[model samples]
Target: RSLRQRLQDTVGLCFPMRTYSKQSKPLFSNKRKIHLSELMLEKCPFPAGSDLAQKWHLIKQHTAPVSPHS
Candidate 1:
């Protein structure tokens, strides 16, 4: 599967266009700002794209902050 499909299936819970996962830390903790797009540029699924990467960008745009970044 392509990077996009893997994320959409396994982490489908976090990939919808209008939802945020329960955890926000380690996902958006760096730089105090967030960027899912960076993930597609990396390897090892280490980081992962836009509203698709770890479902971070999509979540941020659609929901309120549900947790703290540790």
Candidate 2:
């Protein structure tokens, strides 16, 4: 499998759907809000033109205080 698929699988295994939804309400909401740690952001291989940079920027802006050490 591709690296992305492998990563997704690992993430799925590590953070099961039930746990993810429970901890992250936005997971089930229309407007999803993923608060990924810096390590996760760095590790994820987002595709080009995916607007991931912009989303990461927004997350960074809003979560700077929360992830001060990142």
* Top lDDT hit: 2
Where model 2 places Cα greater than 4 Å from the true spot, the runs are: 1-41, 65-70
CA lDDT, candidate 1, residue 28: 34
Model 1, range 1-70, lDDT digits (tens) per residue? Answer: 4455433456545546766668654443347565656542333332434435655543444244667543
What does candidate 2's lDDT look like per residue over 1-70, in tens digits?
Answer: 4455433445454535545334533334435555555334553456756788667655554345454652
Model 1 CA deviation exceeding 4 Å by range: 1-54, 61-70
Q: What's the C-alpha lDDT at position 30 in model 2?
A: 32
The model with the greatest TM-score is 2
